[PDB]
Paper text:
Chemerin functions as both an adipocytokine and a chemotactic factor and plays key roles in adipogenesis and inflammation. The chemerin receptors chemokine-like receptor 1 (CMKLR1) and G protein-coupled receptor 1 (GPR1), play crucial roles in regulating obesity, inflammation, and cancer, highlighting their potential as therapeutic targets. Although both receptors recognize the same ligand, chemerin, and share high sequence identity, they exhibit distinct signaling properties and biological functions.
Aiming to improve protein stability and yield, the residues L323–Q355 at the C-terminus of GPR1 were truncated. The wild-type CMKLR1 or the C-terminally truncated GPR1 was co-expressed with chemerin and Gi1 protein, then the complexes were purified and analyzed using cryo-electron microscopy (cryo-EM) single-particle analysis, yielding density maps at overall resolutions of 3.5 Å and 3.6 Å for the chemerin–CMKLR1–Gi1 and chemerin–GPR1–Gi1 complexes, respectively. In the chemerin–CMKLR1–Gi1 structure, the long axis of the chemerin core is perpendicular to the membrane plane, while in the chemerin–GPR1–Gi1 structure, the ligand core shifts towards the second extracellular loop (ECL2) with its long axis forming a 45° angle with the membrane plane. Indeed, in the structures of chemerin–GPR1–Gi1, the receptor N-terminus makes extensive interactions with the core region of chemerin, with its residues D20–D27 running anti-parallelly with the residues L111–C117 in chemerin, forming a compact β-sheet. In addition, the side chains of the GPR1 residues Y15, L19, and Y21 form a hydrophobic core with the chemerin residue F37. In addition to the interactions formed by the receptor N-terminus, ECL2 also stabilizes the binding between the receptor and chemerin core by not only interacting with the helical region prior to the C-terminus in chemerin but also making close contact with the receptor N-terminus. Thus, the inactive conformation of GPR1 is more stable and the receptor is unfavorable for G protein binding, as evidenced by our functional data and the relatively poor densities of the chemerin core and the Gα C-terminus in the cryo-EM map of the chemerin–GPR1–Gi1 complex. While in the GPR1 complex, the Gi1 protein exhibits an atypical binding mode to the receptor, with the α5 helix moving towards ICL1, resulting in a 10-degree rotation of the αN helix relative to that in the chemerin–CMKLR1–Gi1 structure. The distinct binding poses of the α5 helix are likely due to the substitutions of the CMKLR1 residues S1403.53 and V1413.54 with two larger residues H1383.53 and L1393.54 in GPR1, which form a spatial hindrance and push the α5 helix away.
Numbering used by the authors:
A (entry chain L): 23 to 41, 45 to 90, 97 to 103, 109 to 117, 133 to 142, 146 to 157
B (entry chain R): 12 to 28, 35 to 315
C (entry chain A): 6 to 53, 182 to 234, 241 to 324, 329 to 354
D (entry chain B): 7 to 128, 133 to 340
E (entry chain C): 12 to 62
């Protein structure tokens, strides 16, 4: 859907921000679960290798060359290509109880 | 122009959702300066009498626990001084957590048993003359160490290192292991820690010290001038530092009016932890080197 | 070398038995009877060759009394062996001031010699003034002028007994490390128990106090 | 016959002084000093829970007995610091203990007017010799059938273990007898009393032969020379004196201005050159028996060194003190 | 004091030798047994049971 396309575009932009750009090679579908917050998607897909040109914008313009996305206009993302439970419940969350002790 | 390999793997948990910080580090530094040197001096000088009675054993155990706690404190000050960033591995964080719990519980239990032993000392002249053997002291210190070491499961099952946005972090994770364990392992463990490490010890210290000072055995040949002040000072020092730490530990309720409603993300809890370190540092100097029995050999 | 293993096992058994015996013996309380003579060491607290042993349990406390009636030899040759007693019971028989053998002077001499001694610089002395019933009758007959001169009080039992207690109390020279518990002769056993409890408190606080 | 006694005493003193022509230190100036002696605590024996009052080395120089106020007689193995025997003595007041020359018997005594003899290998009570009206100060074994004791009633007694009755009674001391020592030939023994006098007695004859005086206080310790022709005594006035049986006169005196405390125990070395004496100054010191100099101090005891002894081979010296410890020096 | 008189007479009748002779005998014994004294001459640890 449009939300899944926007989510994968955001994930690819995050990839391009810091580790050359690689596009999708082994495409796959998604299932999503729209109920917490405006939207939520669960999409997996493989990426390309190396690149024909470097720094060719965030979007992939090079036609010739199992992830995990759980995002909520996104208030949190853990795309790594898991902790989707708390991210999907973000829309109070992300407390990570403690954080302040010798424990 | 390659940043990775055929299998593209990474991790990024990015999510959009001063006055106290400096004071915490200052308190940590003063505690460390007043600590490890003084504790090492106490350890090296405690040779007052070879194979002395139970009091020297209590003092040695307390000093050792405080020394280990304060020499592992610099890891915590490094962690807190790097803007809540933990670059070390999960194993080191687990070891630090376990040894910190062990040392703090050991110190609290040793102080409690010191208070109980003193209460049995002054009040009871008959039943304390037949139950003060050195072997009994060894047995009880072994039991205290075993109880402080076999309490709580930080054994890599309740503590995981997870990097948050641009900052690595290791923390106690009472979840993500089983969906059934929902609000059943984070509250029970905290309540157990509060009731064993603060409730019974504080109650015992209060009852014993108050009944000892107020009634003074109804007998003479006791210097009530220094004794009352020393008891009050040690009680105040114990209470004023561990209490905020334990209320912050029990503060983990997560719903009062908003997500936090207490701005705990700042250095308030680290400041209370520094107060706990200050109390741990101040205990040996307030017990071993200030009383009238000592200070005559040096 | 099984012989060495057997020897070390036997030594371990021996030292365990020694530690157990020492722990058992340390819990008991020991007293030394050092009365004046012919009315002293042969005390009255007994009746309820070498050292005479008395063992009795009172209020969960095992008292071992060492009575010295024999050994008329030099005192200092064996007195240093008694630097482990909780208390020394000095029994003085009243109404013996008129008797000569002078007996009260010897009693004072012994009390001063043992109370102001290096070995007993911290041991507590429990003075027991016995034969008070005969003393009251003898005061009416024999005045207190023949012994203990400068007696200005009247021939009354209360004031005479107070004078006796004062004349025995002021003989002590330390007055700080040791205290004399004076009693007039189950009152005796209760007094002894209280005195030894106070001595135990003081001695044990002198080491493990930590106020 | 007070006048006759005084005349006899004066004649004896004149005869004794006639034989004196040269002091011991006058002719020993040609012997090099042996003051370069530094003994270290080779072994430490622990286990006693009271003040140790007496000890006695064994003939084999490996087993030693020790008596303390806790009522336990401990027989050790100094080679490996292993306790061999523990006898629960019925009397907590023990001042002396003995070890049989054949090693099959031990002795003890104190404030009980009884010397108790136990058999090691056949621990059970074997004999309880009684008959003294004063505290025993030294029980010493002559053989498996004869023992010699000294009491606080100014009496010594040669007993018979087989019959349990006194065989010979030695009397004549004015003060309380404090110690005794047996000659190597087991025919004579000299014993000192509280009257600052030490008398020599014959075991077979049963009568006194020689009397030695010169001390200003009680004599606490005594020990024969290895040759048996001399003996050394220690007093409470920080002074030791050497006497010769043949000369019947004081030979040479050991004293120090710094030392004021008396001597509690004394013993000789294998060759007799070294005299190890324990004092009340929390320390034990070694004296050159032929030069009156001090060769070293055996410091390390936390209380008064009550007793000390030297092995038959003379390879080590064992010291027991009131600090509830035993120290083997070599 | 008949017993004391008899004891004094017996003591006075005992023959005595010169002090120099006794000192010489003691010196002869000392330097005769000096080599056999372990406390005087230091002993090596090879045959020393106490090291």
């Amino acid at each position: 859907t449009e939300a899944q396309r926007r989510g994968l575009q955001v994930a690819l932009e995050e990839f391009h921000k810091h580790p050359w750009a690689f596009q999708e090679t082994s495409v796959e579908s998604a299932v999503d679960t729209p109920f917490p917050a405006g939207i939520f998607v669960r999409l997996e897909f493989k990426l390309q290798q190396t690149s024909c040109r470097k720094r060719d914008w965030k979007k992939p313009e090079c036609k010739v060359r199992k992830c995990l996305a759980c995002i909520k206009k996104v208030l949190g993302r853990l795309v790594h290509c898991t902790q989707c439970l708390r991210v999907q419940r973000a829309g109070h969350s992300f407390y990570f109880p403690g954080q302040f002790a010798f424990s | 122009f390659e940043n990775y390999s055929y299998d593209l793997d990474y991790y990024s948990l990015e999510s959009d959702l001063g006055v106290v910080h400096w004071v915490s580090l200052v308190l940590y530094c003063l505690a460390f300066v007043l600590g490890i040197p003084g504790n090492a001096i106490v350890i090296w000088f405690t040779g007052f009498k070879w194979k002395k009675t139970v009091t020297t054993l209590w003092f040695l155990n307390l000093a050792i626990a405080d020394f280990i706690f304060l020499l592992f404190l610099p890891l915590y000050i490094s962690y807190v001084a790097m803007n809540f960033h933990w670059p070390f591995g999960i194993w080191l964080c687990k070891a630090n957590s376990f040894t910190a719990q062990l040392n703090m519980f050991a110190s609290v239990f040793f102080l409690t048993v010191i208070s109980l032993d003193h209460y049995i000392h002054l009040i009871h002249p008959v039943l304390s003359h037949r139950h003060r053997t050195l072997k009994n002291s060894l047995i009880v210190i072994i039991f205290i160490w075993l109880l402080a070491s076999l309490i709580g499961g930080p054994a890599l099952y309740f503590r995981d290192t997870v990097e948050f946005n641009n900052h690595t972090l290791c923390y106690n994770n009472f979840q993500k292991h089983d969906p059934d364990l929902t609000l059943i392992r984070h509250h029970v463990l905290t309540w157990v820690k509060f009731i064993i490490g603060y409730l019974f010890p504080l109650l015992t210290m209060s009852i014993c010290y108050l009944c000892l000072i107020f009634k003074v055995k109804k007998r003479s040949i006791l210097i009530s001038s220094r004794h009352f002040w020393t008891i009050l000072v040690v009680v105040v020092a114990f209470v004023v530092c561990w209490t905020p730490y334990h209320l912050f530990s029990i503060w983990e309720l997560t719903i009062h009016h908003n997500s936090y409603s207490h701005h705990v993300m700042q250095a308030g809890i680290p400041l209370s932890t520094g107060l706990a370190f200050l109390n741990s540092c101040l205990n040996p100097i307030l017990y071993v080197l200030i009383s009238k029995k000592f200070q005559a050999r040096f | 070398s099984a012989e060495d293993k057997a020897a070390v096992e036997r030594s371990k058994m021996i030292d365990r038995n020694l530690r157990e015996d020492g722990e058992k013996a340390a819990r008991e309380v020991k007293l030394l009877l050092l009365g004046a003579g012919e009315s002293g060491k042969c005390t009255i607290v007994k009746q309820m060759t070498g050292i005479v042993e008395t063992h009795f349990t009172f209020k969960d406390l095992h008292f071992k009394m060492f009575d010295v009636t024999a050994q008329r030899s030099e005192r200092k040759k064996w007195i240093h062996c008694f630097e482990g007693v909780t208390a020394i019971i000095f029994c003085v028989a009243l109404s013996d001031y008129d008797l000569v053998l002078n007996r009260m002077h010897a009693s004072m001499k012994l009390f001063d010699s043992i109370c102001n001694n290096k070995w007993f610089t911290d041991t507590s002395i429990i003075l027991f003034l016995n034969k008070k019933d005969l003393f009251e009758e003898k005061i009416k007959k024999s005045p207190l002028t023949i012994c203990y001169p400068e007696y200005a009080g009247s021939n009354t039992y209360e004031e005479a007994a107070a004078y006796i207690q004062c004349q025995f109390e002021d003989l002590n020279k330390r007055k700080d490390t040791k205290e004399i518990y004076t009693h007039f002769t189950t009152k005796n056993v209760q007094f002894v128990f209280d005195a030894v409890t106070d001595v135990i408190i003081k001695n044990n606080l002198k080491d493990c106090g930590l106020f | 016959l007070r006048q006759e006694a005084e005349q006899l005493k004066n004649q004896i003193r004149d005869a004794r002084k006639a034989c004196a022509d040269a002091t011991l230190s006058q002719i020993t100036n040609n012997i090099d000093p042996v003051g370069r002696i530094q003994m270290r605590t080779r072994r430490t024996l622990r286990g006693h829970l009271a003040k140790i009052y007496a000890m006695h080395w064994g003939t084999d120089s490996r087993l030693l007995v020790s008596a303390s106020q806790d009522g336990k007689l401990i027989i050790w193995d100094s080679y490996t610091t292993n306790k061999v025997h523990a006898i629960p003595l019925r009397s907590s007041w023990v001042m002396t203990c003995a070890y049989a020359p054949s090693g099959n018997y031990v002795a003890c005594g104190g404030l009980d007017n009884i010397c108790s003899i136990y058999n090691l290998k056949t621990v059970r009570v074997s004999r309880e010799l009684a008959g003294h009206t004063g505290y025993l100060s030294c029980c010493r074994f002559l053989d498996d059938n004869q023992i010699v004791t000294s009491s606080g009633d100014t009496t010594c007694a040669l007993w018979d273990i087989e019959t349990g009755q006194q065989t010979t009674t030695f009397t004549g001391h004015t003060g309380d007898v404090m110690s005794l020592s047996l000659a190597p030939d087991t025919r004579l023994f000299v014993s000192g009393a509280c009257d600052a006098s030490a008398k020599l007695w014959d075991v077979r004859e049963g009568m006194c032969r020689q009397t030695f005086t010169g001390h200003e206080s009680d004599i606490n310790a005594i020990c024969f020379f290895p040759n048996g022709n001399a003996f050394a005594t220690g007093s409470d006035d920080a002074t030791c004196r050497l006497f010769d049986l043949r000369a019947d006169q004081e030979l040479m005196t050991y004293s120090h201005d710094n030392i004021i405390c008396g001597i509690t125990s004394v013993s000789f070395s294998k060759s007799g050159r070294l005299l190890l004496a324990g004092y009340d100054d929390f320390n034990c010191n070694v004296w050159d028996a032929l030069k009156a100099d001090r060769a070293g101090v055996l410091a390390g005891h936390d209380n008064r060194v009550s007793c000390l002894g030297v092995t038959d081979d003379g390879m080590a010296v064992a010291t027991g003190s009131w600090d509830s410890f035993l120290k083997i020096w070599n | 004091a008949r017993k004391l008189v008899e004891q004094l007479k017996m003591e006075a009748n005992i023959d005595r030798i010169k002090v120099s002779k006794a000192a010489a005998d003691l010196m002869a014994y000392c330097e005769a047994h000096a080599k056999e004294d372990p406390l005087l001459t230091p002993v090596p640890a090879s045959e020393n049971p106490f090291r």
